Design a protein around this nucleic acid. Structure first.
Lengths: 208, 59, 173, 38, 142
RNA sequence: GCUGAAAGCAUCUAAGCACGAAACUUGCCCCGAGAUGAGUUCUCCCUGACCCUUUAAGGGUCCUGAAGGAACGUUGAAGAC
RNA sequence: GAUGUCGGCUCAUCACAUCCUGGGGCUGAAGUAGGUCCCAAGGGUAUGGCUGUUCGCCAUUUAAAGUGGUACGCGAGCUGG
RNA sequence: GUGAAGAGGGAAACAACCCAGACCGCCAGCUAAGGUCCCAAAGUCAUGGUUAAGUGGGAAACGAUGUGGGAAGGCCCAGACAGCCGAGUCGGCCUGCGCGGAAGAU
């Protein structure tokens, strides 16, 4: 099925009457507005494109303005796409709200993970340290050996080394839906999700 | 190079290079491969006449 | 050879149609069709069918014999039909029929349901006995084998699903 | 099943057949006589 | 005088169309390679391209002999340690029917820049239709 | 295993049909059109005069400078640069 | 007119003559538990006492604590018994 | 006998194996060993046979109704072989080409 686009607000907890505490992530889901419909005859596949949010007028370029004006919708802060299943229909200019999840039990959430920059092998790959005493010479957190002798005489592709870590696309699967609040545009899920406070998120019904 | 060009020209008239050379030898013609390739490229009526000569010799 | 040199009589009441390598036989019990190998020639004399080799193939006689047997079986099937019988042996083993589904209880922690194919009929004259009927020899054989595979006869007491005329050997510990 | 390089009939109920490029011995009286060449 | 040489700026090329239904693979590939190189013209020059354009139709209906339809194997390697992969003729025909003829023809052509350039004149399709009617190809019977 | 001749019988195979595993091809997650075979879809911008010559995907003067981009400044849960 | 040789640490990669998990045939296979052969390389596959030890014996665990090749893998990566 | 102290052509590459001994020039012709579907010069040549294993394009003792050829035996129209009647059927020998036996490390 189709999903929605929201924003990460923070984390809190819910107390139950039986005396359990549930940790939750709070997601704000405003109305998604349909900007384009793609079919088989013209594009070769079946999808919809949506926007959400708001954008200031003097930061919108003319190409973007024309794209929004053909649809007849106000400008937003980005464009996203979803693939359609057999027997799903939509029209240009329609709005979709969070009541789409009223009866869904589990979801998948996608975001962009936090950045750590250049990282070593101990932090990036769980390598073991060498001795801190007993005569070690300048080699405490260094990686060690990286190959064999004259056969094969090179280093293999995919070897584990130091480099950039974080700041990439990640998905977490099968999270419980704790609450859907349609008057305040809120979805509460159980657990932690990728990203930092204030970043964009994509929410879909669970595939497994 | 001369031999390859002669093969191409002869198969267009309906005979192979080896048979064509045999026919010329049996008809007592003594033109060499340089001149044969030159004629193949620049004068096609003459090459057809030579092929007919070789075919008559073989017949 | 010897098998292929015997023609097949076409008893009254059955219709035969030939087209290239395709043959159709129709009778009171139904209709059957088949496509034969490219090394057999079949002829419809007056009330008999004859099979023979074609020049150019090195295995004509074997293919002709196979075709003769198959056509004979088709003719017998569209007039009389074929039947098979199965028996259950054991404590608490049972079977029943509903529509075109057979229900089996055979000592498992779950029941067994079998869906019959198109053209095969089943009956249960007792809780410990099954009878199958049809017009296709190969299909009836396959269905009987599928039913037997759920629990094979075992060698110490003979328990399971068996054929009616099957000799089951036993041994001691 | 007996897998070996020399396969032969062990009694009067044994038979030799060739299936899919393999030489086999099947018996109707004794399961111990079942053989495969390889 | 000096021997004649062909000039790339004045050669003449023609368009042909071929049907592959029921033909033996390698015995079709030899002809295709011969005519892409240009060994059938009396102006053949080793360092110039003097061949024709060929369209091939019905590539999923090409034939093989023996037990090859299930026993011929195509191999390749990905560059990562342990990455050796294989497929059979049936599987190749099921997922990418054009590669079967493309690979065979490419193996029979010269290796180098000029051979890579000769390969570009071959157009292979899987069905019975093409969209090159503006070039007016003529029928070739192989 | 089913049906079945060569070999009047028997036979899982020669012609036909059915099952069968963490191995194979997919299904799950990430990169990806420098895929030189460089793909598709939506939107936005530019609508003046002359001269010479060896006359053609030719050279030059005047008028005009769009959509957009970059540079500079205040900076970030982005970062060795 | 020089290719630093045992053992430990860190980091690995391949074969299959398979230690565990998966699928089968025979049994001098009643059940539970075993013996033997065939197919199968996806993933997994101990911590301590003694000794410079690789091995080996002992103590207590585990579904299991596989056998070999890679300069008896790896000192312009560490140690120096 | 060749290399050493010897070039050119063939055997993928390959001093010592096979063909053959380079005074200099030529955009002439004939052949050796080895070859003629494409990479790559020349027969998709002609006539009669064998193989179904990609054998050809790695290996033994031993095992088996794969199948081509040759010379002799036993039974059979006075009824043979197989099964439950009406033409063939049994077991050795010599020889051509194939099948299993056949597991390794970028």
């Amino acid at each position: 099925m189709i999903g929605l686009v929201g924003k990460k607000v923070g984390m809190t907890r819910i107390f139950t009457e039986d005396g359990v505490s549930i940790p939750v992530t709070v997601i704000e889901v405003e109305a998604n507005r349909v900007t384009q419909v793609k079919d088989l005859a013209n594009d070769g596949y079946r999808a919809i494109q949506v926007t959400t949010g708001a954008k200031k007028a003097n930061r919108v370029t003319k190409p973007e303005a024309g794209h929004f004006a053909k649809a007849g919708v106000e400008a937003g802060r980005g464009l996203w796409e979803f693939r359609l299943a057999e027997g799903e229909e939509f029209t240009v200019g329609q709005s979709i709200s969070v009541e789409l999840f009223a009866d869904v039990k589990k979801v998948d959430v996608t975001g962009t993970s936090k950045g750590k920059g250049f990282a070593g092998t101990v932090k990036r790959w769980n390598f073991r340290t060498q001795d801190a005493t007993h005569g070690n010479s300048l080699s405490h957190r260094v990686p060690g050996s990286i190959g064999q002798n004259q056969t094969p005489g090179k280093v293999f592709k995919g070897k584990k080394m130091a480099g950039q870590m974080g700041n990439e696309r990640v998905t977490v699967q099968s999270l419980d839906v704790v609450r859907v609040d349609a008057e305040r545009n809120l979805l509460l899920v159980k657990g932690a999700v990728p990203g930092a406070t204030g970043s964009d998120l994509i929410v879909k019904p669970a595939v497994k | 190079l001369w031999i390859a060009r002669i093969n191409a020209a002869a198969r267009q008239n309906g005979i192979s290079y080896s048979k064509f050379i045999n026919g010329l030898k049996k008809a007592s013609v003594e033109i060499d491969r340089k001149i044969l390739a030159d004629i193949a490229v620049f004068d096609k009526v003459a090459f057809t006449a030579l092929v007919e000569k070789a075919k008559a010799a073989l017949a | 050879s010897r098998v292929a040199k015997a023609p097949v009589v076409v008893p009254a009441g059955v219709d035969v149609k030939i087209n290239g390598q395709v043959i159709t036989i129709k009778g009171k019990n139904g209709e059957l069709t088949r496509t034969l190998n490219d090394a057999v020639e079949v002829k419809h004399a007056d009330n008999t069918l004859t099979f023979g080799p074609r020049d150019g193939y090195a295995d004509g006689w074997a293919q002709a014999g196979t075709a003769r047997a198959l056509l004979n079986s088709m003719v017998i099937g569209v007039t009389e039909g074929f039947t098979k019988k199965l028996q259950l042996v054991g404590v608490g083993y049972r079977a029943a029929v509903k529509g075109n589904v057979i229900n089996l209880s055979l000592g498992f922690s779950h029941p067994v349901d079998h869906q019959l194919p198109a053209g095969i009929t089943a009956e249960c004259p007792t809780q410990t006995e099954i009878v199958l009927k049809g017009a296709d020899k190969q299909v009836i054989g396959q269905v009987a084998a599928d039913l037997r595979a759920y629990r094979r006869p075992e060698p110490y007491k003979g328990k399971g699903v068996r054929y009616a005329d099957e000799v089951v050997r036993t041994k001691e510990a | 099943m007996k897998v070996r390089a020399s396969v032969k009939k062990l009694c009067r109920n044994c038979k030799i057949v060739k299936r899919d490029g393999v030489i086999r011995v099947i018996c109707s009286a004794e399961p111990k006589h079942k053989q495969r060449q390889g | 005088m000096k021997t004649f040489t062909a000039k790339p700026e004045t050669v003449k090329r023609d368009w042909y169309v071929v049907d592959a239904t029921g033909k033996t693979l390698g015995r079709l590939a030899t002809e295709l390679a011969r005519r892409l190189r240009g060994k059938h013209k009396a102006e053949y020059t080793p360092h110039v391209d003097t061949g024709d354009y060929i369209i091939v139709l019905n590539a999923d209906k090409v034939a093989v002999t023996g037990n090859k339809r299930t026993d011929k194997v195509y191999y390749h390697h990905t560059g990562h340690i342990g990455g050796i992969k294989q497929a059979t003729f049936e599987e190749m025909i099921a997922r990418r029917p054009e590669r079967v003829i493309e690979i065979a023809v490419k193996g029979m052509l010269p290796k180098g820049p000029l051979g890579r350039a000769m390969f570009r004149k071959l157009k292979v399709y899987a069905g019975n239709e093409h969209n090159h009617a503006a070039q007016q190809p003529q029928v070739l019977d192989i």
